[PDB]
Amino acid sequence: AEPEHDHRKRMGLKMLLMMGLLLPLVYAMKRHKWSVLKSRKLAYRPPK
Amino acid sequence: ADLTEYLSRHYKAPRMVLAAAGGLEHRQLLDLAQKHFSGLSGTYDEDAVPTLSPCRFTGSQICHREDGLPLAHVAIAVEGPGWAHPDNV
């Protein structure tokens, strides 16, 4: 029914291990850029 | 008291320079310096005299948004080296 069975599970382990690297890495990349906004401080200074 | 404390700590002879330029001999500049400045640090060389310490440059932004003003001012700088550095030229 499914001769690909063993190949798909091999690529799956590669997929899971790669994603275990790339998901925290791209997360850090996105957080690094969003740093400037996420830690920003506002002050309101109207006259008189 | 704040003001005289500042004066006491900072206006001390090894930290100040009598400069002149023009129609003068150096000799009389020296003469007048002993005449009028010599009661400054003859025995006043005392207390924590007074180390500066390096200033941490950041890399950051301050944005005072005021749309009521007709022109934008922007100043941008990287950290330069001090007075001493040959890189200045």
Side-chain angles (χ1 to χ4, degrees):
Chain A
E2 197 192 55
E4 71 254 37
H5 177 274
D6 286 41
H7 206 181
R8 63 153 248 247
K9 289 179 167 180
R10 195 199 244 88
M11 299 201 325
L13 165 74
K14 293 168 168 202
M15 193 268 303
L16 285 170
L17 290 164
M18 277 322 287
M19 228 60 106
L21 240 112
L22 288 169
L23 274 165
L25 281 174
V26 178
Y27 197 31
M29 275 186 84
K30 114 96 229 204
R31 279 277 193 134
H32 172 265
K33 236 120 253 234
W34 276 81
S35 237
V36 188
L37 296 177
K38 306 267 217 228
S39 85
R40 89 183 156 170
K41 259 111 197 89
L42 308 179
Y44 178 43
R45 278 176 71 89
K48 82 220 146 92
Chain B
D2 283 321
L3 291 171
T4 49
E5 207 282 330
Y6 183 91
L7 287 165
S8 241
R9 266 274 203 105
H10 294 289
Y11 279 29
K12 300 242 226 191
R15 306 167 88 265
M16 38 175 269
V17 194
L18 180 71
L24 57 118
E25 279 142 62
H26 183 69
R27 246 194 206 121
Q28 54 181 246
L29 217 230
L30 229 194
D31 274 333
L32 292 159
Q34 192 61 32
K35 211 124 95 187
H36 303 296
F37 285 94
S38 56
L40 233 154
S41 300
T43 6
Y44 298 91
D45 263 57
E46 224 149 273
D47 299 298
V49 275
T51 327
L52 250 190
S53 88
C55 292
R56 179 195 70 198
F57 182 95
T58 303
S60 59
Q61 209 168 81
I62 181 171
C63 299
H64 194 150
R65 176 98 183 252
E66 223 294 65
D67 285 2
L69 309 164
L71 297 169
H73 281 60
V74 184
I76 170 148
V78 294
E79 199 196 340
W83 293 103
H85 213 307
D87 283 2
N88 280 301
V89 182

Coordinates of all heavy atoms in Angstrom, one line a residue, chain A residues 4-44:
Chain A
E4 N 6.9 3.9 0.3 CA 7.5 5.1 0.8 C 7.7 5.1 2.4 O 8.5 5.9 2.9 CB 6.8 6.3 0.4 CG 5.4 6.6 1.1 CD 4.2 6.3 0.2 OE1 4.3 5.3 -0.7 OE2 3.2 7.0 0.3
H5 N 7.0 4.2 3.1 CA 6.8 4.1 4.5 C 8.1 4.4 5.3 O 8.1 5.2 6.3 CB 6.3 2.7 4.9 CG 6.1 2.5 6.4 ND1 7.2 2.0 7.1 CD2 5.1 2.6 7.2 CE1 6.7 1.8 8.4 NE2 5.5 2.2 8.5
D6 N 9.2 3.7 5.0 CA 10.5 3.8 5.7 C 11.2 5.1 5.4 O 11.9 5.6 6.3 CB 11.4 2.6 5.4 CG 10.9 1.3 6.1 OD1 9.6 1.1 6.2 OD2 11.7 0.5 6.6
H7 N 11.1 5.6 4.1 CA 11.7 6.8 3.7 C 11.1 8.1 4.4 O 11.8 8.9 4.9 CB 11.7 6.9 2.2 CG 12.7 7.8 1.6 ND1 12.8 8.0 0.2 CD2 13.7 8.5 2.1 CE1 13.9 8.8 0.0 NE2 14.4 9.1 1.1
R8 N 9.7 8.1 4.4 CA 9.0 9.2 5.1 C 9.3 9.3 6.6 O 9.3 10.4 7.1 CB 7.5 9.2 4.8 CG 6.7 8.0 5.2 CD 5.2 8.3 5.5 NE 4.9 8.1 6.9 CZ 4.1 7.2 7.5 NH1 3.4 6.3 6.7 NH2 3.9 7.1 8.8
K9 N 9.5 8.2 7.3 CA 9.9 8.2 8.7 C 11.3 8.6 8.9 O 11.6 9.3 9.9 CB 9.5 6.8 9.4 CG 8.0 6.6 9.5 CD 7.7 5.3 10.2 CE 6.2 5.3 10.6 NZ 5.8 4.0 11.2
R10 N 12.2 8.3 8.0 CA 13.6 8.8 8.0 C 13.7 10.3 7.8 O 14.4 11.0 8.6 CB 14.5 8.1 6.9 CG 16.0 8.3 7.1 CD 16.8 8.0 5.9 NE 17.8 6.9 6.1 CZ 17.5 5.6 5.9 NH1 16.3 5.3 5.4 NH2 18.4 4.7 6.1
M11 N 12.9 10.8 6.9 CA 12.8 12.3 6.6 C 12.1 13.0 7.8 O 12.5 14.1 8.1 CB 12.1 12.6 5.3 CG 12.9 12.0 4.0 SD 12.5 12.8 2.4 CE 10.8 13.2 2.5
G12 N 11.1 12.3 8.4 CA 10.4 12.8 9.6 C 11.3 13.1 10.8 O 11.2 14.1 11.4
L13 N 12.3 12.1 11.1 CA 13.3 12.3 12.1 C 14.2 13.5 11.8 O 14.6 14.3 12.7 CB 14.1 11.0 12.4 CG 15.4 11.0 13.1 CD1 15.3 11.2 14.7 CD2 16.2 9.8 12.9
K14 N 14.6 13.6 10.6 CA 15.4 14.8 10.1 C 14.6 16.1 10.2 O 15.1 17.0 10.9 CB 15.8 14.5 8.6 CG 16.9 13.4 8.5 CD 17.2 13.0 7.1 CE 18.4 12.1 7.0 NZ 19.0 12.1 5.6
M15 N 13.3 16.1 9.8 CA 12.3 17.2 10.0 C 12.2 17.6 11.4 O 12.4 18.8 11.7 CB 11.0 16.8 9.4 CG 10.0 17.9 9.2 SD 8.9 18.2 10.6 CE 8.1 16.6 10.8
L16 N 12.0 16.7 12.3 CA 11.9 17.0 13.8 C 13.1 17.5 14.4 O 13.1 18.5 15.1 CB 11.4 15.7 14.6 CG 9.9 15.2 14.6 CD1 9.9 13.9 15.3 CD2 9.0 16.2 15.3
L17 N 14.3 16.9 14.1 CA 15.6 17.4 14.6 C 16.0 18.8 14.0 O 16.5 19.7 14.7 CB 16.7 16.4 14.3 CG 16.8 15.1 15.1 CD1 17.7 14.1 14.4 CD2 17.2 15.2 16.6
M18 N 15.7 19.0 12.7 CA 16.0 20.3 12.0 C 15.1 21.4 12.6 O 15.6 22.5 13.0 CB 15.7 20.2 10.5 CG 16.9 19.7 9.7 SD 18.5 20.3 10.2 CE 18.5 22.0 9.7
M19 N 13.8 21.1 12.9 CA 12.8 22.0 13.4 C 13.1 22.3 14.9 O 12.9 23.4 15.3 CB 11.4 21.4 13.3 CG 10.4 22.4 12.8 SD 10.7 23.1 11.1 CE 9.6 22.2 10.2
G20 N 13.7 21.3 15.6 CA 14.3 21.5 17.0 C 15.5 22.5 17.0 O 15.8 23.0 18.1
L21 N 16.2 22.6 15.9 CA 17.2 23.7 15.8 C 16.6 25.0 15.3 O 16.7 26.0 16.0 CB 18.3 23.3 14.8 CG 19.8 23.2 15.4 CD1 20.3 21.8 15.5 CD2 20.7 24.1 14.5
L22 N 15.8 25.0 14.2 CA 15.3 26.1 13.5 C 14.2 26.9 14.2 O 14.2 28.2 14.1 CB 14.9 25.8 12.1 CG 15.9 25.4 11.0 CD1 15.1 24.9 9.8 CD2 16.7 26.6 10.5
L23 N 13.3 26.2 14.9 CA 12.2 26.9 15.6 C 12.7 27.8 16.8 O 12.2 28.9 16.8 CB 11.1 25.9 16.1 CG 9.9 25.6 15.1 CD1 9.2 24.4 15.7 CD2 9.0 26.8 14.9
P24 N 13.7 27.3 17.7 CA 14.2 28.3 18.6 C 15.2 29.3 18.1 O 15.2 30.5 18.6 CB 15.0 27.3 19.6 CG 15.1 26.1 18.9 CD 14.0 25.9 18.0
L25 N 15.9 29.0 17.0 CA 16.8 30.0 16.3 C 16.1 31.1 15.6 O 16.4 32.3 15.8 CB 17.7 29.3 15.3 CG 19.0 28.6 15.9 CD1 19.7 27.8 14.7 CD2 20.0 29.5 16.6
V26 N 15.0 30.8 14.8 CA 14.2 31.8 14.1 C 13.4 32.7 15.2 O 13.2 33.9 15.0 CB 13.2 31.2 13.0 CG1 12.3 32.3 12.4 CG2 14.0 30.6 11.9
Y27 N 13.0 32.0 16.2 CA 12.4 32.7 17.4 C 13.3 33.7 18.0 O 12.8 34.8 18.3 CB 12.0 31.6 18.5 CG 11.0 32.1 19.5 CD1 10.0 33.0 19.3 CD2 11.0 31.4 20.8 CE1 9.1 33.4 20.3 CE2 10.1 31.7 21.8 CZ 9.1 32.7 21.5 OH 8.2 33.1 22.5
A28 N 14.6 33.4 18.2 CA 15.6 34.3 18.7 C 15.8 35.5 17.8 O 15.8 36.6 18.2 CB 16.9 33.6 19.0
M29 N 15.9 35.2 16.4 CA 16.0 36.1 15.4 C 14.8 37.1 15.4 O 15.1 38.4 15.3 CB 16.0 35.4 14.0 CG 17.4 35.0 13.6 SD 17.3 34.3 11.9 CE 17.4 35.9 10.9
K30 N 13.6 36.6 15.5 CA 12.4 37.5 15.6 C 12.3 38.3 16.9 O 12.1 39.5 16.9 CB 11.1 36.7 15.3 CG 10.1 36.5 16.4 CD 9.0 37.5 16.4 CE 8.8 38.1 17.8 NZ 7.5 38.7 18.0
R31 N 12.7 37.6 18.1 CA 12.8 38.3 19.3 C 13.8 39.4 19.4 O 13.5 40.6 19.8 CB 13.0 37.3 20.5 CG 11.7 36.6 21.0 CD 10.9 37.5 22.0 NE 9.9 36.8 22.7 CZ 9.7 36.8 24.0 NH1 10.5 37.5 24.8 NH2 8.6 36.2 24.6
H32 N 15.0 39.1 18.8 CA 16.1 40.1 18.7 C 15.7 41.4 18.0 O 16.1 42.5 18.4 CB 17.3 39.5 17.9 CG 18.4 40.4 17.6 ND1 18.5 41.0 16.3 CD2 19.5 40.8 18.3 CE1 19.6 41.8 16.3 NE2 20.2 41.6 17.4
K33 N 15.0 41.3 16.9 CA 14.4 42.4 16.2 C 13.3 43.1 16.9 O 13.3 44.4 17.1 CB 14.1 42.1 14.7 CG 14.8 43.0 13.7 CD 15.7 42.2 12.7 CE 17.1 42.5 13.0 NZ 17.9 43.0 11.9
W34 N 12.4 42.3 17.5 CA 11.3 42.9 18.3 C 11.7 43.5 19.7 O 10.9 44.3 20.3 CB 10.2 41.9 18.4 CG 9.3 41.9 17.3 CD1 9.5 41.2 16.0 CD2 8.1 42.5 17.1 NE1 8.5 41.5 15.2 CE2 7.6 42.3 15.8 CE3 7.3 43.3 18.0 CZ2 6.3 42.8 15.3 CZ3 6.0 43.9 17.5 CH2 5.6 43.6 16.2
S35 N 12.9 43.2 20.2 CA 13.6 43.8 21.3 C 13.4 45.4 21.4 O 13.1 45.8 22.6 CB 15.1 43.6 21.2 OG 15.6 43.0 22.3
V36 N 13.6 46.1 20.3 CA 13.5 47.6 20.3 C 12.2 48.1 20.6 O 12.0 49.1 21.4 CB 13.9 48.1 18.8 CG1 14.1 49.6 18.8 CG2 15.2 47.5 18.4
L37 N 11.1 47.4 20.2 CA 9.7 47.7 20.5 C 9.3 47.1 21.9 O 8.7 47.9 22.7 CB 8.8 47.2 19.4 CG 8.9 47.8 18.0 CD1 7.9 47.1 17.1 CD2 8.6 49.4 18.0
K38 N 9.7 45.9 22.2 CA 9.2 45.2 23.4 C 9.7 45.8 24.7 O 8.9 45.9 25.8 CB 9.4 43.7 23.4 CG 8.8 43.0 22.1 CD 7.3 42.5 22.3 CE 7.2 41.1 21.6 NZ 5.9 41.1 20.7
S39 N 10.9 46.5 24.7 CA 11.4 47.2 25.8 C 11.3 48.7 25.8 O 11.7 49.4 26.8 CB 12.9 46.7 26.1 OG 13.8 47.4 25.3
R40 N 10.7 49.3 24.8 CA 10.5 50.7 24.6 C 9.7 51.3 25.8 O 8.8 50.7 26.4 CB 9.9 51.1 23.3 CG 8.4 51.1 23.2 CD 7.8 51.4 21.8 NE 6.4 50.9 21.6 CZ 5.6 51.2 20.6 NH1 6.1 51.9 19.6 NH2 4.4 50.7 20.6
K41 N 10.1 52.6 26.1 CA 9.5 53.3 27.1 C 8.9 54.6 26.6 O 9.5 55.3 25.8 CB 10.4 53.5 28.3 CG 10.1 52.6 29.5 CD 11.2 51.6 29.7 CE 10.7 50.4 30.6 NZ 10.1 49.3 29.8
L42 N 7.6 54.9 26.9 CA 6.9 56.1 26.5 C 6.8 57.0 27.7 O 6.6 56.6 28.9 CB 5.5 55.7 26.0 CG 5.3 54.7 24.9 CD1 3.8 54.6 24.7 CD2 6.0 55.1 23.6
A43 N 7.0 58.3 27.4 CA 6.6 59.4 28.3 C 5.8 60.4 27.5 O 6.0 60.6 26.3 CB 7.8 60.1 28.8
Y44 N 4.8 61.0 28.2 CA 3.9 62.0 27.7 C 4.2 63.3 28.4 O 4.2 63.4 29.7 CB 2.4 61.6 27.9 CG 1.4 62.6 27.5 CD1 1.5 63.3 26.2 CD2 0.2 62.8 28.2 CE1 0.4 64.2 25.8 CE2 -0.9 63.6 27.8 CZ -0.7 64.3 26.6 OH -1.7 65.2 26.2

